[PDB]
Write an enzyme that holds these catalytic residues in place. Structure first.
Site, PDB file in Angstrom:
ATOM      1  N   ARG A   1       0.857  -1.172   0.000  1.00  0.00           N
ATOM      2  CA  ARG A   1       0.000   0.000   0.000  1.00  0.00           C
ATOM      3  C   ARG A   1       0.899   1.230   0.000  1.00  0.00           C
ATOM      4  O   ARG A   1       0.717   2.136  -0.816  1.00  0.00           O
ATOM      5  CB  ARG A   1      -0.900   0.007   1.245  1.00  0.00           C
TER       6      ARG A   1
ATOM      7  N   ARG B   1       2.009   6.745  13.352  1.00  0.00           N
ATOM      8  CA  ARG B   1       0.791   5.947  13.206  1.00  0.00           C
ATOM      9  C   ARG B   1       1.013   4.463  13.448  1.00  0.00           C
ATOM     10  O   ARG B   1       0.279   3.846  14.214  1.00  0.00           O
ATOM     11  CB  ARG B   1       0.178   6.143  11.812  1.00  0.00           C
TER      12      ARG B   1
ATOM     13  N   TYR C   1      16.852  11.452   5.648  1.00  0.00           N
ATOM     14  CA  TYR C   1      18.144  11.950   6.111  1.00  0.00           C
ATOM     15  C   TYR C   1      18.592  13.054   5.140  1.00  0.00           C
ATOM     16  O   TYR C   1      17.746  13.721   4.545  1.00  0.00           O
ATOM     17  CB  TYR C   1      19.148  10.789   6.145  1.00  0.00           C
TER      18      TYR C   1
ATOM     19  N   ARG D   1      23.774  24.673  14.872  1.00  0.00           N
ATOM     20  CA  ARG D   1      24.567  24.356  13.687  1.00  0.00           C
ATOM     21  C   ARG D   1      23.948  23.121  13.018  1.00  0.00           C
ATOM     22  O   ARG D   1      24.530  22.047  13.052  1.00  0.00           O
ATOM     23  CB  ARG D   1      26.021  24.080  14.114  1.00  0.00           C
TER      24      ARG D   1
ATOM     25  N   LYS E   1      18.293  11.175  13.173  1.00  0.00           N
ATOM     26  CA  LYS E   1      19.374  10.300  13.629  1.00  0.00           C
ATOM     27  C   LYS E   1      18.839   9.066  14.368  1.00  0.00           C
ATOM     28  O   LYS E   1      19.274   7.947  14.093  1.00  0.00           O
ATOM     29  CB  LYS E   1      20.331  11.066  14.550  1.00  0.00           C
TER      30      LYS E   1
ATOM     31  N   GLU F   1      24.504  16.478  19.044  1.00  0.00           N
ATOM     32  CA  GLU F   1      24.402  16.657  17.601  1.00  0.00           C
ATOM     33  C   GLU F   1      24.082  18.085  17.196  1.00  0.00           C
ATOM     34  O   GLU F   1      23.172  18.704  17.753  1.00  0.00           O
ATOM     35  CB  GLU F   1      23.310  15.741  17.040  1.00  0.00           C
ATOM     36  N   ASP F   2      24.833  18.593  16.228  1.00  0.00           N
ATOM     37  CA  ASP F   2      24.630  19.934  15.695  1.00  0.00           C
ATOM     38  C   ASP F   2      24.626  21.105  16.682  1.00  0.00           C
ATOM     39  O   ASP F   2      23.769  21.993  16.602  1.00  0.00           O
ATOM     40  CB  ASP F   2      23.362  19.940  14.836  1.00  0.00           C
TER      41      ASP F   2
ATOM     42  N   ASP G   1      28.633  13.384  17.801  1.00  0.00           N
ATOM     43  CA  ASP G   1      28.605  12.769  16.480  1.00  0.00           C
ATOM     44  C   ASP G   1      29.360  13.552  15.403  1.00  0.00           C
ATOM     45  O   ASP G   1      30.037  12.961  14.561  1.00  0.00           O
ATOM     46  CB  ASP G   1      27.146  12.561  16.053  1.00  0.00           C
ATOM     47  N   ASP G   2      29.247  14.872  15.440  1.00  0.00           N
ATOM     48  CA  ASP G   2      29.888  15.736  14.457  1.00  0.00           C
ATOM     49  C   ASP G   2      31.404  15.707  14.521  1.00  0.00           C
ATOM     50  O   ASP G   2      32.076  15.756  13.488  1.00  0.00           O
ATOM     51  CB  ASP G   2      29.380  17.156  14.658  1.00  0.00           C
TER      52      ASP G   2
ATOM     53  N   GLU H   1      34.469  21.678  14.041  1.00  0.00           N
ATOM     54  CA  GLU H   1      34.113  20.391  14.644  1.00  0.00           C
ATOM     55  C   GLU H   1      34.522  19.172  13.813  1.00  0.00           C
ATOM     56  O   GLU H   1      35.281  18.322  14.288  1.00  0.00           O
ATOM     57  CB  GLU H   1      32.598  20.344  14.911  1.00  0.00           C
TER      58      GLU H   1
ATOM     59  N   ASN I   1      27.148  19.043   4.288  1.00  0.00           N
ATOM     60  CA  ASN I   1      25.737  18.765   4.025  1.00  0.00           C
ATOM     61  C   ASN I   1      24.908  20.014   4.299  1.00  0.00           C
ATOM     62  O   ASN I   1      25.339  20.888   5.046  1.00  0.00           O
ATOM     63  CB  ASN I   1      25.232  17.638   4.930  1.00  0.00           C
TER      64      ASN I   1
ATOM     65  N   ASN J   1      29.502   9.653   5.221  1.00  0.00           N
ATOM     66  CA  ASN J   1      28.605  10.293   6.171  1.00  0.00           C
ATOM     67  C   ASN J   1      28.627   9.465   7.452  1.00  0.00           C
ATOM     68  O   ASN J   1      28.657   8.237   7.376  1.00  0.00           O
ATOM     69  CB  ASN J   1      27.195  10.352   5.573  1.00  0.00           C
TER      70      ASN J   1
HETATM   71  N1  LIG Z   1      29.614  13.991   6.118  1.00  0.00           N
HETATM   72  C1  LIG Z   1      29.450  13.813   7.429  1.00  0.00           C
HETATM   73  O1  LIG Z   1      29.370  12.703   7.959  1.00  0.00           O
HETATM   74  C2  LIG Z   1      29.342  15.102   8.270  1.00  0.00           C
HETATM   75  C3  LIG Z   1      29.218  15.028   9.680  1.00  0.00           C
HETATM   76  C4  LIG Z   1      29.165  16.201  10.481  1.00  0.00           C
HETATM   77  C5  LIG Z   1      29.230  17.448   9.873  1.00  0.00           C
HETATM   78  N2  LIG Z   1      29.345  17.532   8.446  1.00  0.00           N
HETATM   79  C6  LIG Z   1      29.335  18.838   7.748  1.00  0.00           C
HETATM   80  O2  LIG Z   1      30.557  19.590   7.976  1.00  0.00           O
HETATM   81  C7  LIG Z   1      30.217  21.014   7.815  1.00  0.00           C
HETATM   82  C8  LIG Z   1      30.886  21.826   8.925  1.00  0.00           C
HETATM   83  O3  LIG Z   1      30.475  21.331  10.226  1.00  0.00           O
HETATM   84  P1  LIG Z   1      31.281  21.737  11.559  1.00  0.00           P
HETATM   85  O4  LIG Z   1      30.572  21.196  12.739  1.00  0.00           O
HETATM   86  O5  LIG Z   1      32.713  21.398  11.391  1.00  0.00           O
HETATM   87  O6  LIG Z   1      31.145  23.320  11.586  1.00  0.00           O
HETATM   88  P2  LIG Z   1      31.920  24.479  12.376  1.00  0.00           P
HETATM   89  O7  LIG Z   1      31.058  25.678  12.437  1.00  0.00           O
HETATM   90  O8  LIG Z   1      32.457  23.906  13.638  1.00  0.00           O
HETATM   91  O9  LIG Z   1      33.143  24.741  11.417  1.00  0.00           O
HETATM   92  C9  LIG Z   1      32.959  25.304  10.134  1.00  0.00           C
HETATM   93  C10 LIG Z   1      34.331  25.604   9.572  1.00  0.00           C
HETATM   94  O10 LIG Z   1      34.210  25.946   8.151  1.00  0.00           O
HETATM   95  C11 LIG Z   1      34.897  27.196   7.955  1.00  0.00           C
HETATM   96  N3  LIG Z   1      34.360  27.967   6.826  1.00  0.00           N
HETATM   97  C12 LIG Z   1      33.127  28.591   6.712  1.00  0.00           C
HETATM   98  N4  LIG Z   1      33.081  29.218   5.498  1.00  0.00           N
HETATM   99  C13 LIG Z   1      34.246  28.953   4.953  1.00  0.00           C
HETATM  100  C14 LIG Z   1      34.607  29.420   3.699  1.00  0.00           C
HETATM  101  N5  LIG Z   1      33.807  30.194   2.974  1.00  0.00           N
HETATM  102  N6  LIG Z   1      35.846  29.067   3.243  1.00  0.00           N
HETATM  103  C15 LIG Z   1      36.675  28.286   4.009  1.00  0.00           C
HETATM  104  N7  LIG Z   1      36.275  27.853   5.249  1.00  0.00           N
HETATM  105  C16 LIG Z   1      35.036  28.200   5.718  1.00  0.00           C
HETATM  106  C17 LIG Z   1      34.822  27.902   9.265  1.00  0.00           C
HETATM  107  O11 LIG Z   1      35.866  28.868   9.433  1.00  0.00           O
HETATM  108  C18 LIG Z   1      34.941  26.793  10.258  1.00  0.00           C
HETATM  109  O12 LIG Z   1      36.344  26.545  10.557  1.00  0.00           O
HETATM  110  C19 LIG Z   1      28.692  21.109   7.879  1.00  0.00           C
HETATM  111  O13 LIG Z   1      28.150  21.497   6.615  1.00  0.00           O
HETATM  112  C20 LIG Z   1      28.220  19.725   8.212  1.00  0.00           C
HETATM  113  O14 LIG Z   1      26.976  19.417   7.568  1.00  0.00           O
HETATM  114  C21 LIG Z   1      29.406  16.353   7.661  1.00  0.00           C
HETATM  115  O1  LIG Z   2      -1.248   0.372   5.750  1.00  0.00           O
HETATM  116  C1  LIG Z   2      -1.553   0.768   6.865  1.00  0.00           C
HETATM  117  O2  LIG Z   2      -2.229   0.032   7.647  1.00  0.00           O
HETATM  118  C2  LIG Z   2      -1.143   2.141   7.354  1.00  0.00           C
HETATM  119  C3  LIG Z   2      -0.753   3.179   6.496  1.00  0.00           C
HETATM  120  C4  LIG Z   2      -0.345   4.575   7.018  1.00  0.00           C
HETATM  121  O3  LIG Z   2      -0.350   4.842   8.242  1.00  0.00           O
HETATM  122  O4  LIG Z   2      -0.016   5.413   6.119  1.00  0.00           O
HETATM  123 MN   LIG Z   3      25.434  16.612  12.568  1.00  0.00          MN
END
Ligand SMILES: NC(=O)c1ccc[n+]([C@@H]2O[C@H](COP(=O)([O-])OP(=O)(O)OC[C@H]3O[C@@H](n4cnc5c(N)ncnc54)[C@H](O)[C@@H]3O)[C@@H](O)[C@H]2O)c1
Ligand SMILES: O=C(O)/C=C/C(=O)O
Ligand SMILES: [Mn+2]
Ligand SMILES: NC(=O)c1ccc[n+]([C@@H]2O[C@H](COP(=O)([O-])OP(=O)(O)OC[C@H]3O[C@@H](n4cnc5c(N)ncnc54)[C@H](O)[C@@H]3O)[C@@H](O)[C@H]2O)c1
Ligand SMILES: NC(=O)c1ccc[n+]([C@@H]2O[C@H](COP(=O)([O-])OP(=O)(O)OC[C@H]3O[C@@H](n4cnc5c(N)ncnc54)[C@H](O)[C@@H]3O)[C@@H](O)[C@H]2O)c1
Ligand SMILES: NC(=O)c1ccc[n+]([C@@H]2O[C@H](COP(=O)([O-])OP(=O)(O)OC[C@H]3O[C@@H](n4cnc5c(N)ncnc54)[C@H](O)[C@@H]3O)[C@@H](O)[C@H]2O)c1
Ligand SMILES: NC(=O)c1ccc[n+]([C@@H]2O[C@H](COP(=O)([O-])OP(=O)(O)OC[C@H]3O[C@@H](n4cnc5c(N)ncnc54)[C@H](O)[C@@H]3O)[C@@H](O)[C@H]2O)c1
Ligand SMILES: NC(=O)c1ccc[n+]([C@@H]2O[C@H](COP(=O)([O-])OP(=O)(O)OC[C@H]3O[C@@H](n4cnc5c(N)ncnc54)[C@H](O)[C@@H]3O)[C@@H](O)[C@H]2O)c1
Ligand SMILES: O=C(O)/C=C/C(=O)O
Ligand SMILES: [Mn+2]
Ligand SMILES: [Mn+2]
Lengths: 553, 553, 553
Positions: B47, B71, B92, B145, B163, B235-236, B258-259, B294, B401, B446
Site C-alpha cells: 500500500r 501511526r 536523512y 549548527r 538520527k 548533535e549539531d 557525532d559531528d 568540529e 551537508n 557520512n
Molecule cells: N559527512 C558527514 O558525515 C558530516 C558530519 C558532520 C558534519 N558535516 C558537515 O561539515 C560542515 C561543517 O560542520 P562543523 O561542525 O565542522 O562546523 P563548524 O562551524 O564547527 O566549522 C565550520 C568551519 O568551516 C569554515 N568555513 C566557513 N566558510 C568557509 C569558507 N567560505 N571558506 C573556508 N572555510 C570556511 C569555518 O571557518 C569553520 O572553521 C557542515 O556542513 C556539516 O553538515 C558532515
Molecule cells: O497500511 C496501513 O495500515 C497504514 C498506512 C499509514 O499509516 O499510512
Molecule cells: Mn550533525
C-alpha cells in the site's frame, strides 16, 4: 477528562497541539512534550490553508483534511468552518465518491464501527467496544448504493464518515456523540473481490434472513447501550432494503432514511423556491421524474403532501406526477415491475408510449424535470431544448451524484434554455456565463441542506419517531430563508456559504414544530426555542482543560 | 502490554492497523474498531510503496513517511527496511535539511522532548513527562549548527528525530528506548524570530552562564531518571559548545559528539580504503582541510591517532595536516584567532601565504583535500584541476551537508580529474559516466555509517565512557567490510543498501574491542560476541500481543 | 505519577487519605472525593494508635496494621516507625507465624507474586504482570519450612511479605522496589489439602526435576525483567533445597539464603558480644548445637571463619563444634545419615554416646549451647541447670521460632541459672526480674538485625554476588554498636527500638567493605559512604504529588 499526559495528545478528541496553554501543559503533564511555542487556533488554521493552497488534486486534499480529524478534532472543524463552500467538494460530493472508490488504497486509520455478518450473535460486544459513552446519532450504510457509484462494500464507509462531519460542521452536533457505522455482509462488486486492499469480507452479499437478523441485532445493540431515542440515519442502502427497513423501524426507533426523506425535503424546497418566479397554478404543474427509486419516490410523496396541504386531494395531486426508469415510462400494465410505492404514480399509458426520455418530455410536456437515476448525462441537449420550447421557465433538477453521474451540467442547462431554466444539481457547479453576458449561479439541491438541521432538532427534543411531516416542515424552513435577491441570481437555495446558519434556523423551526405537535419529550419545554438551540450547538473553539483550582475561605 | 482497546490503536508503538489478528482484536477489545479485513505487513508495505510512487516532491514524501512513524511504528521501519537506499535521501540528508528549514510549516505532531531556558530549574519534571521508562539512547541538539544550514533553533528538532530513526533502521536499537531532545535557549536566526509558525522561544540565544547551567541540569536529570550509562549523543551544537561540552562530560557521562567523533571515523575509514588503491607512503601523505571546525578537528585528530598507531610520532603526523578556514590558511601568528584544538595543526607560515584555497593547493601540494566548511561549492573546477595535475590519484572528500552546501559534486570530481580521483561526499550523488564510457560509483562519507553500530555496542556493553580509540576501531571495522570489487567501482565505503548488515558488523567488533579493553560492564561476558549482538537487535516484524493463555494440568 | 483521579486513592502506594492537600485535590481531580478536612500524617497516626489500643488479640492487630499496607503505604510505615519494638511481635515473630497458619482464613487481598508448578513454561508472563517496573529486591519461599511450623505451602506467603516490610521499616529500602514471591508446587501438609480455604494447588509437593526446572525458570525470568543484579533472598525453603539452591545460584545471581547466612551473622554477633563479658580463651570454647540443619550449619561455618580469622586453622576450629539432631549426636559411623555440610562437624564418638541432649551436655561439657531445631522446649530445666553447673557464665541461645517452638524461655534460662547465663532468643521475651531483685533484659538473636542492612548495602553498591565474608562483616558491624551499659542489662544486641539506625550503620559498614574488596559496581565510588547510604533511604513522610507549575520569564 480523566486523562493526563501523552494520552491527551494521542486522542484527536482532546489534542490541541501547541494550542495547549502553558498552565494546561504543566498541570496535565505535557510540559516538554510540546515545542516551547504556544499557538492560537488562528495560527494553526493559517498553517493549514498555507499547505492546502499548494496542493494539486482534490483527493490529495481529502487525505490531508480527513487526516486532521484523526489528529486534532477541534482544528478539523475550525478548518471546515473557515470556508465550508470551498471544502464541501472535497470532504463531500464529488470527492468523497472518489475517496470511497479508493478507500483501501488511501487507508491510514479506520473511522467508525464495522459490524460484519461474521459477527452475527456478537454485535453487542462490538457496540461495547466503541470508546464514547453518550452517542446520540448514528449514520449507517451497507455500501450497496454509494451515491451513483453502485456497490462499494466496506469502501462505502467514507459516506457515513462524511455525512457525520456535516452533522457537526453544519449544525454543531457534538462530534463525540456521533457514530459512523458500516454493516458488512459482503459485496457483489466483482472488482473489489479481487482487490488486495479491499477492507471487507471477500464474499458476495448475504441476502438471506441473516442479513435482516443482523440489521435487527444492530438496532437492538445500539439502542440498548445508548438509548431508544438514539437517532439512527440510514444512508446509501440498496433500493429494496431502504424502504423495507424504514417502514419496519420508523415506529419502533428514532430513525429515518436520508436518501428517501432527506432528498425529498431539499428537492421540494427547491420547487417552493421556483414557485416564486413561476407563480403558475400547481394545477398546471406537471412533474416528470427520470428514475423511480428511493429519491424519486421520496420526493414525489413529499410533493404530494405539499399539494394536499394546499387543497388538492392525494388522488389528483399524484396524477400530476410521472416517472420514467431504466425500462421506460411507468404506466399501468407495463411489462416492467411496479412496486407498492410506485403504484400511486403509475398511470394509464397515454395515446402513445414514449420510447426515450426526450419523447416522454414532448408527449407529457412536463413543466418540471427531476433527475435521480445516477446513470449519467441523460438530460441530453435535446431533452433540455425540448423543455425550453415546451416551457417559458422550465424546472431542471439533475440531482444524481457524484458529478460524472449527474443528468446534465449547469453549463448545459442554462446555455440551452437561453437562461430561462430554473436549475439545481446534487453536485456543485460554478456560476455560468452565456456568450450573452448574463451570469447565473446554480443552487445545489442536496440533502446536506436538510439532515443536519433536522438531526439537531430531533436530538435536542428527545424525539422518539420521525414522521414525514417533519420533512415537509424542514422543506418550508429551508425555502423560507431564501431572499428575493438570491432568486434573482438563479439561486433556488440559500448560499452554501451560510449553511451553518441555515441549518440552525431549520433546527429551530423543527423544534418548535415537534413541540407544537407533541412529538418532543425534552422537559421542561423551552420558552424560547431559538435561544435553546443556539445555546446547545458545539463550537470549534478550544475549551480549557485546566482543573478547577481555587482558594478556600 | 498494560493497555487494551482504542489506546492500542492510538499509540503508534502498538498499532498494527488491519494487521491485528482476529484473536488479538477479540481479546483486546478492538473488534468492530477495525475493518473486517485482516492484513499482513506485506500488504501494508505494498500500500505504501504504491502511494509513494505517485508522489512528486521529496518534502511531500518526507511528510508521508515520517507521518507513518506517528501511526504504525512497526510499519514505519518495515518501509525503511524495504529500500533504505532510496529513502535515505528523504528521511536523512538532504531532505531532512529542507524539513528542518520548514519544520514549523509542516508540523502535525511533536516528536521528542523539548527543554527550554524558561524551564530552568524544572528540567527533571519535563524529563519525568516522557512516557517511556527504559531510555538507553538520547540524541540532543540546541539547533545552532544544523547541517550546513546554520542556526535553525527549535526547527532543528528534525535532526535528533532523523538520527534516532537510523539508530533503529540501521542498528536495530529499540525505538521505545530512544529519546530525541531539543534544547531551546532561543535563536539568532532573524527570519525565525519573525516567523509566526516558529516552534521555539522568541528571543536571541542565551549565551550567559544560564546556558551551561541548563545543559548541566539536563545531563543530570536524564541520568537521574534513566541511569548514568545512558548514551548521550550531542548533535549539531555550535562550534565552541561542541568541544567544551564533549571535554566537560565525556569522563562523567556516557557521551560523545557525532559531528566531531562520528565524522572522524567515517572519513578515516574512507582514507583507509583509499590506501588500498594508492599504497603511497604515509611520508608522501599531505592532507589539507577546507574548514577547521568540529568535523575538521575531529577527523584530523583521528587521522593522527591512526598514523601514530602505525609508527609516526604525534608531532610528525600532525605536521602532515594543514587547515584553511573562512579567514585563510591557519599559520602561526595570523590575525585570525587560533583555538587550542587548532594549534596542533597550525604551522609556520609557508614561503608565500596562499590567498585562496586554490593557491593553498598549489603551494602546499596536498595529496588529499577534505571539505567540511558547509559553505558551498568551494572545491572549484580549478581547485579540482590542480589536484589532478599535482596527484595521479587525488583524494577528494566533499563532506559538507546538505547537497547545496557540498564543496563539489561527484560529476565535477570525476569529470575534471578524468576519472583519476578517489571521491566521497557527505550527501548522496548518483553514478557518474564519462564520455569515454567509464562509470564511477561514489561512496557517501557520512557518519550514518558509524553512530548506529557504535551506539548499539556502547549500549549493549553497558559502557560507561567512550574513548576516541573506540571510533578508531569503528573506522577500521567499517573499511574491512569493503570488497575489492566494490572498491573497483569507485566505492570507498560498503554499499549503502547494506548499511544494516554493515552496522551490525561494526557493533560486533566494537563490542569485542570494548570487552578486550575492559570498558564493557555487561556481565557475564558473552563468549560469541557476534551471536550476542544479533540476538538483541530489534526487528520490524509484528509481535503477538495476545495474552498468555494456557490450560492447567 | 501518570495517573490522576480516583485511581490515586485506590492505589495504596499513592493514597494519602485526608492528607492530600487542597491544591493536590483540586489539581489531581480528587476535590469532593475526600471529606473537606485536611489532615496531617500525625493525626492519622494518632487515629491508628487509638484504635490499636482498644484491640485485644495479636492476630486482630496483625489484620489491622497489615490492612493499612493495602490502603495507605506511607501511613503503614509511619505507624511501624512510631514504635517498631511494640509492633515487631505483631507483624513478625511470633504472630506472623499464627497468621500464616490461618492465612486462608484471614485473607482479604493478595500480596505478592504467586508462581505455581502449573505455570511451568509461562513464568515470564507472570513476572510481566507485576505492576512495578524497577524491582531491586525479591524474597521468595516455597513455604516448606515456615519458621518452626513446617510445611504451610502457599499459606507461607505471609513470610516474604513480612521480611519485605522489614526491608523498608528497618533499612529504608523503597517499598515499590520490593517483590514478595511464593513458589507453589504443592504441599505435604495433610490438614491444608482438606482445607476449603487453602490458597494453593491441592496436590502433594512435586519433588521431581520439574521443581528444579521451575526455580530455574523463576530465577531467569526475574533477572531477565529486572536485571542480573536483582537481589534474590531465599526464605524458608526445606533443608535439602536450601543449601543446594544457594550453592547452585550464588555465583550466577545476586542471591543468599537468609536462614543459613543471615542467622549465622546474628548468632555470631551475639557470641562476639558474649565474649565481651566472658573473655575466656577460644581454646576452651566448646559449642554444642541443638539441631544440624540450615541454621546450625550456617552459624557453624561462620563461627569457624571468625576463628580462622583470629588464628586457629579451619580443621582446629571445626573441632570446637558439636551438633545433636533428631537422631542424636553427630559422630563418625552413627547410623543416622550425615550430609556433606555436616561431615566437618561429625567427630569421633566421645567416651560414651549421649542419648538425650542433657547427656550430650554433661558428657561434652560445652561452654555454649545453640538451639535451632524448631521442635519446642528441648532446653529443659535439667539441660539449663547442667549448663550453669558446667559453666560460671553459660551461653544459652534458644533461636527457634515462633515462641512455642523455642528451646526455652528467658524466665527459665535466667531463673534456673541464677542470673549467670548470657541468653538470646529468636522470638521476643520481656525482662526477667529474679526474686533477689536483679533484672535481666534478653536480646533477640534474630536475622532481622542483619538482612535489612546487608540488603540495603548490596542494592546500593550494585553488588553482583554475595560472599560469606559479607555476613562475617555484618556480624561485626552489629556487635560493634553494642554499648557497655546495654551489655550490663544482659543485651547481646543493640536495643530493638533502634533497629532503624542499627541497620543503617550495618549498611554503611557493609558498603565500605564491598567497595574495599572490589565487589561494588556502583560508579563513581562515593567518597563518604555514610552520607551516600543516608541520602538514599526511603522516608515515610508524605511527598508532594503536585505537578510542577511555574511562571515563564
Ligand atoms: N559527512 C558527514 O558525515 C558530516 C558530519 C558532520 C558534519 N558535516 C558537515 O561539515 C560542515 C561543517 O560542520 P562543523 O561542525 O565542522 O562546523 P563548524 O562551524 O564547527 O566549522 C565550520 C568551519 O568551516 C569554515 N568555513 C566557513 N566558510 C568557509 C569558507 N567560505 N571558506 C573556508 N572555510 C570556511 C569555518 O571557518 C569553520 O572553521 C557542515 O556542513 C556539516 O553538515 C558532515
Ligand atoms: O497500511 C496501513 O495500515 C497504514 C498506512 C499509514 O499509516 O499510512
Ligand atoms: Mn550533525
Ligand atoms: N434520558 C436523558 O434525558 C439523559 C440520560 C443520560 C444523561 N443525560 C444528560 O443530562 C444532561 C441534561 O439533560 P437535558 O435533557 O436537560 O439536556 P439538554 O436540554 O441540554 O439537551 C437535550 C438532549 O440533546 C442532547 N444534546 C445537547 N447538545 C447536543 C449537541 N450539541 N450535540 C449532540 N447532542 C446534544 C443532550 O445529550 C440531551 O440528550 C445532558 O447533558 C445529558 O448528557 C440525559
Ligand atoms: N442530491 C441529493 O440530495 C441526493 C440524495 C440521494 C440520492 N441522490 C442520487 O440519486 C441517484 C439514485 O439514487 P436512488 O437511491 O434513488 O437509487 P435507486 O437505485 O433506488 O433508483 C434508481 C432509479 O434510476 C433508474 N435508472 C437507472 N438507470 C437508468 C437509466 N439508464 N435511464 C433511466 N432511468 C434509470 C432505475 O430504474 C431506478 O428507478 C444516485 O445517483 C444518488 O447519488 C441525490
Ligand atoms: N518490562 C521491562 O521493564 C523490561 C523488559 C525487558 C527487558 N528489560 C531490561 O533489559 C535488561 C535485560 O536485557 P537482556 O537480558 O535481553 O539483554 P542484555 O542485558 O544482554 O543487554 C544489555 C543492555 O543492552 C540493552 N538492550 C538490549 N537490546 C537493546 C536494543 N535492541 N535496543 C536498545 N537497548 C538494548 C539492555 O537494556 C541492557 O541494558 C534488564 O536489565 C531489564 O532492565 C526491562
Ligand atoms: N521509575 C523508575 O523506574 C526509576 C525512577 C527514578 C530512578 N530510577 C533508577 O535510579 C538510578 C539512578 O540512581 P539513583 O540516584 O537512584 O541512586 P544510585 O545510583 O546512587 O543507587 C544505586 C542503586 O541503588 C538503588 N536504590 C537507591 N535507593 C534505593 C532505595 N532506597 N531502595 C531500593 N533501591 C535503591 C538504585 O535503583 C540503583 O540501582 C537509575 O539507574 C534509574 O534506572 C528508576
Ligand atoms: N532466630 C533466627 O534468626 C532464625 C533464623 C532462621 C531459622 N530459625 C529457626 O531455626 C529452626 C530450624 O530451622 P532450620 O532451617 O535450621 O531447619 P532444618 O529443617 O534445616 O533443620 C532442623 C534441625 O533440627 C533437628 N531436630 C528436629 N527435632 C529435633 C529434636 N526433637 N531434637 C533434636 N534435634 C532436632 C533436625 O534433625 C534438623 O537437623 C526453625 O524453628 C527456625 O524458626 C531462627
Ligand atoms: O497545526 C497543528 O497544530 C496541526 C496540524 C495537523 O494536524 O495537520
Ligand atoms: Mn446518500
Ligand atoms: Mn526464615
Amino acid at each position: 477528562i480523566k486523562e493526563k499526559g501523552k494520552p491527551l495528545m494521542l486522542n484527536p478528541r482532546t489534542n490541541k497541539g501547541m494550542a495547549f496553554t502553558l498552565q494546561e501543559r504543566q498541570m496535565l503533564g505535557l510540559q516538554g512534550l510540546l515545542p516551547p511555542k504556544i499557538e492560537t487556533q488562528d495560527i494553526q488554521a493559517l498553517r493549514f490553508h498555507r499547505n492546502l493552497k499548494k496542493m494539486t488534486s482534490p483527493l490529495e486534499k481529502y487525505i490531508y483534511i480527513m487526516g486532521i480529524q484523526e489528529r486534532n478534532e477541534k482544528l478539523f472543524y475550525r478548518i471546515l468552518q473557515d470556508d465550508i463552500e470551498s471544502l464541501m467538494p472535497i470532504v463531500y460530493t464529488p470527492t468523497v465518491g472518489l475517496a470511497c472508490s479508493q478507500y483501501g488504497h488511501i487507508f491510514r486509520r479506520p473511522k467508525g464501527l464495522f459490524i460484519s455478518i461474521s459477527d452475527r450473535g456478537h454485535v453487542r460486544s462490538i457496540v461495547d467496544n466503541w470508546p464514547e459513552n453518550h452517542v446520540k446519532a448514528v449514520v449507517v450504510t451497507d455500501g450497496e448504493r454509494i451515491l451513483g457509484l453502485g456497490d462499494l462494500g466496506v469502501y462505502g464507509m467514507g459516506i457515513p464518515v462524511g455525512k457525520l462531519c456535516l452533522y457537526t460542521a453544519c449544525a454543531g452536533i457534538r462530534p463525540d456523540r456521533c457514530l459512523p457505522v458500516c454493516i458488512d455482509v459482503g459485496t457483489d462488486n466483482i472488482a473489489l473481490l479481487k482487490d488486495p486492499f479491499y477492507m471487507g469480507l471477500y464474499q458476495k452479499r448475504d441476502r438471506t434472513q441473516q442479513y435482516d437478523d443482523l440489521i435487527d441485532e444492530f438496532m437492538k445493540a445500539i439502542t440498548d447501550r445508548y438509548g431508544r431515542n438514539t437517532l439512527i440515519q440510514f444512508e446509501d442502502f440498496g433500493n429494496h432494503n431502504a424502504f423495507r427497513f424504514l417502514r419496519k423501524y420508523r415506529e419502533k426507533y428514532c430513525t429515518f432514511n436520508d436518501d428517501i426523506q432527506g432528498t425529498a425535503a431539499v428537492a421540494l424546497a427547491g420547487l417552493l423556491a421556483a414557485q416564486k418566479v413561476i407563480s403558475k397554478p400547481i394545477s398546471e404543474h406537471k412533474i416528470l421524474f427520470l428514475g423511480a427509486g428511493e429519491a424519486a419516490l421520496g420526493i414525489a410523496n413529499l410533493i404530494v403532501m405539499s399539494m394536499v396541504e394546499n387543497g388538492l386531494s392525494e388522488q389528483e395531486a399524484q396524477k400530476k406526477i410521472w416517472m420514467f426508469d431504466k425500462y421506460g415510462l411507468l404506466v399501468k400494465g407495463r411489462k416492467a415491475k411496479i412496486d407498492s410505492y410506485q403504484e400511486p404514480f403509475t398511470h394509464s399509458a397515454p395515446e402513445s408510449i414514449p420510447d426515450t426520455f426526450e419523447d416522454a418530455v414532448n408527449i407529457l410536456k412536463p413543466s418540471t424535470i427531476i433527475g435521480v437515476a445516477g446513470a449519467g448525462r441523460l438530460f441530453t441537449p435535446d431533452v433540455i431544448r425540448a423543455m425550453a420550447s415546451i416551457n417559458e421557465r422550465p424546472v431542471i433538477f439533475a440531482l444524481s451524484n457524484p458529478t460524472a453521474q449527474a443528468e446534465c451540467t449547469a453549463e448545459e442547462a442554462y446555455t440551452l434554455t437561453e437562461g430561462r431554466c430554473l436549475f439545481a444539481s446534487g453536485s456543485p457547479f460554478g456560476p455560468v456565463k452565456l456568450t450573452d453576458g448574463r451570469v447565473f449561479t446554480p443552487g445545489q439541491g442536496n440533502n446536506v441542506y436538510i439532515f443536519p438541521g433536522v438531526a439537531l432538532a430531533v436530538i435536542l427534543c428527545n424525539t422518539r419517531h420521525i414522521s414525514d411531516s417533519v420533512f415537509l416542515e424542514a422543506a418550508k424552513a429551508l425555502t423560507s430563508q431564501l431572499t428575493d435577491e438570491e432568486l434573482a441570481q438563479g439561486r433556488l437555495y440559500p448560499p452554501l456559504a451560510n449553511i451553518q446558519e441555515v441549518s440552525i434556523n431549520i433546527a429551530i423551526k423543527v423544534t418548535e414544530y415537534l413541540y407544537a405537535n407533541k412529538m418532543a419529550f425534552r422537559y421542561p419545554e423551552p420558552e424560547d426555542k431559538a435561544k435553546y438551540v443556539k445555546e446547545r450547538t458545539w463550537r470549534s473553539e478550544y475549551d480549557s482543560l485546566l482543573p478547577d483550582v481555587y482558594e478556600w475561605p
